[PDB]
From TrEMBL, chain A:
Residues 68-91 form a coiled coil. This is 60 kDa protein.
Automatic annotation (TrEMBL), chain C:
This is Gp64. The chain holds residues 314 to 416 of 417 of the full protein. It comes from the Viruses.
UniProtKB/TrEMBL annotation, chains D, H:
This is 30 kDa protein. InterPro entries: SU10_adaptor. It comes from Enterobacteria phage N4. It comes from the Viruses. Pfam families: SU10_adaptor. The lineage of its organism: Viruses, Duplodnaviria, Heunggongvirae, Uroviricota, Caudoviricetes.
Automatic annotation (TrEMBL), chain E:
The chain holds residues 2 to 56 of 556 of the full protein. This is 60 kDa protein. It comes from the Viruses.
Length: 91, 49, 103, 236, 55, 88, 73, 236, 69
């Protein structure tokens, strides 16, 4: 029944404590300790906005990775001197 | 001298006792045998001898 | 060559550590006594110690205080014979040995 | 909390600037004149700590079977006793510090069971006496008995001997008083009339600074507590 | 302006408390972290000690 | 004089307000603006985080997708005609 | 007495504290985004290529293995 | 708010004009005598901030499991501790404000939950004690307990070492008092009969200016608040 | 405050008492640092022998008895 709860044990990777949301100091120090994450998000916000804009396309492309895996392997044979294919259609 | 405290008998009852020096709790006396080392010091050369 | 310089080969040793005293670090000074007794396997009966080095006499006071601390550590360890390094420096700087004042 | 070297430099720059003690570059006090400054500083610190009640310390004393007078000295401390002379010490310094001999006045004594023990009360048989200002008596030592002594303390001795206390712990407002006392001591010891007048000036400055500090209560010396005799006497 | 560590049960108001921490600070000072280190992991020490003969 | 930041709930005279701003000023001073900048644009962050699986996978096939992209114009190659010829 | 004024903009607990709590209660999203910045940077780099592929996603599949077999056939 | 070079040039062009400290152009003080002026300036700032109560500052202290004494020193600050000496700090700082220890007197102490804690009350079990002016005591530390200390503060230390504080924060009515104190120190240090007569004048000028500022209450030192004991005593 | 979290006599004193009542175990362990360190030195060999405990014995007396018989 030894108690281990304290401000010393807490690190920046720990999750929040549901009991101590009411304590204002706990929430304020919770936000203050994890400023590297907020700064990392803030410095690169344009990239996140662009990715959010292009989200639908990425969404579509995700269902079709498996086919592209085989198509990428086939590409090397698929080259086949593409100009020859017009003649092949002719013949 | 905490190490001496740990590794010691520290029992008051002892067989050693000097009759020539018997005193109560009132008496306090500094020993006559002062213990002091000798250190290196540069001569002053301002105090002319 | 560590193998050749072991106790059965040579009767006694003389040890010098000037860099520690000159730099004044004084925390790694106890290592030399341990090295002499154990690593080289020489008895404490025959160990000779040389203390201190004072060049550029304008730096006498700090180095001689470091020499005092080193001599204190050496006396604590129990070395039989101890040497100030040189006659020239000792006579030039006027080193004398006296009990410290009590105040 | 500055070391003794900072004190020497501040003296070399402040008062005693014009004197012959200071080195040529005005950086530090000369070597042969340091014990004088150390003695003066110790005297000044004892004066201030006697006047102001800035430090409150504590000590733990264990009771032996045949001893009644328990002098509070460093000889009987765990961290400082000599095993050959003293077989068993009764002052415990297990955790930290070394208990420098700094007993000015004894305020409270509490038993190991949480009960207070009266001091210097003739008509109370279960009281503790002090035949000397730092010696403590209990006339009925018992087994498994320990006393806690709460006393007013003074600043530990400064020695500058590679084993003494280098640091000085004093409130920041009381530095000029210490410097004025040191300057007074020096200029008095000079033994000339002009230096005597300067010493009078410095002593008066010391007194005025101490009185100002008392006026504004910067050390929080005044103490006021909640009334407890209202209920004891039976009032409603 | 000081509280004596041996002045436990000062409850003239009988709040409840005992204030036994000052004695711990007075005797076990700056080394309490080792005590908590050992106290947290007592089951492992107990299990190791129980099998001492075999070991 | 001054007001102690931890002296929240001083509302003895009237019940309203708790005065929680001084703690924010004391602990997160000069960095509140970054917090507000992130907080205003939080829906985008939530949407991006919700898709950290798909968006994660694509990071893995990026070189392959670039190699495929290098031949996008050629990948159509009008398959119908040579398919009909091969059917013969 | 009461200085709250408009309830829509002014919060009883405090504007700054309200924003701080709003961020605190939703930290896992920020942590998940921040842990992977090096990965979302590459997608931002290759956004143009991904958009170009998206245009040809509808076509260019054509059950491509069937086309390979037809070439073999 | 002005630099310390403005202070040096004000001294070079005010009092101490006729002295030999100043440079030939009388625009700044020579490099040899700057430490003396810095020491005198720090002494004067401490005197004024002790007398007038112009700055009120704050400290946040976190409580550990096994500690009852919490000295307010920079050794335990988060930005300034030594990791090997101190395992865990308990004084919360910021990278910009590194908490130079400037505690003169402690006024209020408030819990993290918004309830005030009695200070130096002997008869209250749930009170905080200060054995020394810069040390706190809580005899019952608890989990998730944090204390806010509201205290009177002094001016930060002037150092002129590219890391110390160059600036001076002082109301513009108290500049002649600071200059007069510096001139008093400098003229006493000369040890001549005429310089002492000038120093007496400068010290008296310092005192008269301080008394005038108290007389007109230019720092708004006097404070009055509404009466709350009318309701607590049961009056109608 | 919190009943489960905070101990009424004192957190530090509660931990100290808890350690005090369980002193014989710590003493028994501490008397034998050398033996436990020696055991820890040869843990891989002991694990390897454990993996071969069911086999590799075969009543090794029977092994040379079979040559005798």
């Amino acid at each position: 029944t030894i108690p281990n709860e304290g401000y010393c044990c807490e690190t920046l990777n720990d999750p929040i404590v549901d009991k101590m949301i009411g304590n204002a100091y706990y929430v304020v120090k919770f936000v203050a300790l994890r400023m590297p994450f907020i700064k990392n998000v803030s410095d690169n916000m344009t990239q996140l906005l662009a990715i959010h804009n292009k989200l639908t396309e990425l969404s579509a492309i995700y269902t079709k990775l498996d086919e592209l895996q085989l198509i990428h392997n086939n590409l090397d044979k698929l080259q086949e001197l593409y100009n020859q294919l017009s003649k092949l259609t002719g013949l | 001298s905490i190490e001496d405290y740990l590794k010691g008998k520290n029992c008051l009852a002892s067989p050693n006792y000097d009759p020539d020096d018997q005193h109560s709790s009132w008496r306090e006396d500094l020993p006559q045998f002062k213990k002091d080392r000798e250190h290196l010091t540069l001569v002053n050369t301002r105090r002319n001898r | 060559p560590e193998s050749e310089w072991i106790f059965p080969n040579y009767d006694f040793v003389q040890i010098e550590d000037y860099d520690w005293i000159i730099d004044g670090r004084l925390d790694l000074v106890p290592l030399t006594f341990d090295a002499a007794v154990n690593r080289l396997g020489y008895p404490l009966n025959v160990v000779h110690y040389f203390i201190g080095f004072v060049l550029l006499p304008e730096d006498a006071k700090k180095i001689w205080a470091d020499v005092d601390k080193a001599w204190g550590l050496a006396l604590e360890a129990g070395i039989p014979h101890i040497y100030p390094w040189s006659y020239t420096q000792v006579m030039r700087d006027g080193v004398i040995y006296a009990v410290p004042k009590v105040c | 909390m500055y070391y003794i070297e900072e004190l020497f430099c501040r003296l070399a720059n402040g008062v005693l600037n014009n004197t012959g003690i200071v080195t040529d570059d005005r950086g530090d006090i000369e070597d042969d004149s340091k014990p004088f400054i150390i003695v003066a500083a110790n005297e000044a610190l004892t004066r201030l700590h006697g006047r102001f009640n800035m430090r409150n310390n504590n000590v733990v004393v264990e009771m032996q079977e045949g001893r009644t007078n328990y002098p509070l000295l460093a000889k009987y401390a765990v961290q400082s006793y000599d095993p050959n002379e003293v077989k068993c010490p009764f002052i415990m310094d297990l955790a930290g510090e070394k208990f420098a001999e700094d007993v000015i006045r004894i305020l409270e004594v509490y038993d190991d069971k949480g009960r207070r023990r009266p001091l210097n009360d003739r008509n109370n048989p279960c009281s503790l006496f002090t035949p000397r200002p730092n010696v403590l008596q209990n006339n009925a030592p018992k087994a498994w008995e320990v006393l806690n002594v709460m006393y007013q303390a003074k600043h530990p001795k400064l020695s500058t001997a590679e084993d003494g206390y280098n640091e000085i712990d004093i409130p920041d407002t009381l530095d000029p008083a210490l410097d004025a006392y040191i300057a007074y001591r020096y200029y008095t010891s000079l033994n000339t009339p002009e230096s005597s007048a300067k010493a009078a000036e410095y002593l008066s400055f010391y007194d005025s600074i101490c009185r100002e500090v008392v006026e504004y209560d910067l050390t929080s010396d005044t103490e006021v507590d909640t009334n407890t005799l209202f209920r004891k006497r039976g009032w409603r | 302006s000081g509280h004596t560590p041996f002045n436990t049960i000062p409850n003239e108001g009988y709040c409840c408390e005992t204030l036994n921490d000052p004695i711990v600070d007075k005797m076990i000072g700056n080394a309490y972290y080792v005590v908590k280190f050992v106290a947290l992991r007592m089951p492992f020490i107990k299990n190791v000690s129980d099998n001492m003969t075999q070991l």
